[PDB]
Design a protein around this ligand. Structure first.
Ligand SMILES: *Cc1c(COP(=O)(O)O)cnc(C)c1O
Ligand SMILES: *Cc1c(COP(=O)(O)O)cnc(C)c1O
Lengths: 396, 396
């Protein structure tokens, strides 16, 4: 049965991990996957999380299955975090959230759901974007189209080209927007632009799908949701897939959520049943540990205070590295000006290097980045900055 | 987009939980889902697991993503547990295991894998069987056929009808076998019958797919795999989906595995790449906590000793309840003879009650079982035995 099975192509992102664990060259630099690092170059377990794990270890009395949609508390707090304390969607009870295995699992679920319960036939993703997006919706049987977004020449968001790109989008089509910290450009729409988009969205009859994996890394928790809330204020329906992998550093515990919004509670409940059906034939119930941690923290004033401060420290350290990166390049004899990199927010920065330059960086200097030229700023420490900037200056 | 979405039908098994959490009638008895209970009627966290969680809490330094296939140690130990210490499949390196989110998630993955990388078009499941099996393979686009298995009149395994049932099975077809503790009959093939089936399997060109969710609940860890190992000794290819939800009591942490076997390491590796591709577009990486616990326990002589004793206690308590159940029915004026229930192994017993009798049990006595008449013996305690047997005797 498996005689003629073809070897699968490597994942442009996860595949980097493999090449790293096969390269001896001591002194490598990992700027690939979007995982946070501290001054040490370690991806530590947040303190709030450890204290939360401590709590669960002492108070858990059973591992009995969770309901298909996960921990109820987790969902409520996820909803407050996205829409805001006194959001109408909550008061009107127009939102239903399912705890899912990571932000990727949420997209998988949203995709399976749409494919077989609605008439959606196309999904519009951005270019440049996150490759996995296409792969996930394609595996669900949906076709993927792309819309313009980045101005490679001025290192900014080409709103005109975006609008003209989405004119070809028909009503009933899904449009996927990155909540904040766009991957990989790091360029997000301004509030005024989100408003114009929310307005445009309604008028064209698009189904908004927000992918929220970096809430808290741009400016702040509440600030980073302005875009989403702008849409949420004008739409009857929308889907939000969020992740807690980054802002909680719970990468391997797979904590995410899929939120569904409808006109009224009667509709969202009816639709939510089909989402749960979609989940049951996949993994059945979501993993408890990771989400339990998140709920424990968010519901405990003390623990939440600590967590919010830890998130702030991560956001700030990345900002420091972003500035240290630019300066070091100039100081090291950088060819062009990389000042635009300060404008970008999040863990990534679209360097602008070519596929060959990136290929040469890992081949000759052991510096690993994604072929697209995307580099993980959160992977830069004061210790690797120099060798890192010298190699980049050597391939320019 | 969601205006006309139809309300999904309730799951015959998980749906019971819902009706339970909506019934006030104090004194209810839950004999639905296959979750273990102690004398108290509680589903406690095993001690070995707590000690293991203790260890991780003190030794984990990062939550950084696991590889797509999960924790390497977990896989090795899962393989030893299934095939045996000195198995050839291991020495020859013909097996690859992917840590998955539960035994259900493993089936989902095996299904997605088969659907788009092999020519498999049909899957043969048993009747009676586990309803989710059909739902999972159907969602993957594969068609599901059924083969005879239970002799409702003699409460035994109708081997003749099974063989004649599978004659209609074409080569390249998948046949799903329950490793042990068949759900729901509790009737498993004898070693001689497994051998005859393994032999028949090869000759017809079927692709064996074992679902192993109750390893350790029939007779013992090594004994319960005799069937699987009988097949493994004659096949070049096969798939094993196992769960650790029951024998480790890790239900909500979603710990399972999908093992793939091929003729040689070159083939299994090539095929495994496509399985990993299948996983990446689903949930990306598996949840760490649950599997970390399992690996920690299995790799630690001390902790393993404790665990094996806890598994033995569960197996024995179920056996005691099974005997206490029969006696209490006679003693309470039972109509027919239920001695056949002692022959069944595992958490479930196929009572033989009709859909109406079962419907009346929950309606008038607050006793919950699955419409098929399947009851969770592991849910019976010395305290609920009486009211439980009196209600059953009242609907006979
Ligand atoms: C990290 C990320 C996700 C989701 O990651 P999970 O690990 O599955 O939670 C989704 N979208 C983007 C753009 C991301 O960067
Ligand atoms: C419990 C069970 C499974 C898998 O359960 P998970 O919770 O997904 O690990 C699979 N097959 C049968 C027959 C089962 O009883």
């Amino acid at each position: 049965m498996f005689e003629n099975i073809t070897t699968a192509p490597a994942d442009p992102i996860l595949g980097l991990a493999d090449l790293l664990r096969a390269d001896e060259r001591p002194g490598k630099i990992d700027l690939g996957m979007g995982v946070y690092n501290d001054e040490t170059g370690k991806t530590p377990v947040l303190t709030s999380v450890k204290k939360a794990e401590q709590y669960l270890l002492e108070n858990e009395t059973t591992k009995n299955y969770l309901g298909i949609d996960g921990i109820p508390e987790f969902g409520r707090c996820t909803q407050e975090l996205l829409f805001g304390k006194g959001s109408a969607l909550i008061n009107d009870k127009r939102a239903r959230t399912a705890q899912t295995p990571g932000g990727t699992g949420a997209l998988r679920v949203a995709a399976d759901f749409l494919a077989k319960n609605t008439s959606v036939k196309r999904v519009w993703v951005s270019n440049p974007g996150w490759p996995t997006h296409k792969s996930v919706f394609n595996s669900a049987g949906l076709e993927v189209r792309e819309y313009a977004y980045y101005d490679a020449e001025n290192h900014t968001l080409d709103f005109d080209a975006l609008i003209n790109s989405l004119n070809e989008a028909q009503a009933g089509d899904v449009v996927l927007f990155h909540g904040c910290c766009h991957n990989p450009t790091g360029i997000d729409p301004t509030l005024e632009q989100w408003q114009t988009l929310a307005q445009l969205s309604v008028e064209k009859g698009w189904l908004p799908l927000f992918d929220f994996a970096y809430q808290g890394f741009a400016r702040g928790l509440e600030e980073d949701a302005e875009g989403l809330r702008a849409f949420a204020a004008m739409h009857k329906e929308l889907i939000v897939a969020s992740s807690y992998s980054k802002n909680f550093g719970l990468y391997n515990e797979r904590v995410g959520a899929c939120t569904l919004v409808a006109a009224d509670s009667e509709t969202v409940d009816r639709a939510f049943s089909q989402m749960k059906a979609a989940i049951r034939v996949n993994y059945s119930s979501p993993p408890a540990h990771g989400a339990s941690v998140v709920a424990t923290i968010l519901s405990n004033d003390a623990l939440r205070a600590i967590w919010e401060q830890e998130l702030t420290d991560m956001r700030q350290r990345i900002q420091r590295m972003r500035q240290l990166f630019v300066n070091t390049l100039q100081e090291k004899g950088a060819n062009r000006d990389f000042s635009f990199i300060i404008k970008q927010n999040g863990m990534f920065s679209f360097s602008g290097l070519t596929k060959e330059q990136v290929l040469r960086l890992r081949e000759e200097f052991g510096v690993y980045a994604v072929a697209s030229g995307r580099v993980n700023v959160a992977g830069m420490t004061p210790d690797n900055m120099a060798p890192l900037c010298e190699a980049i200056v050597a391939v320019l």
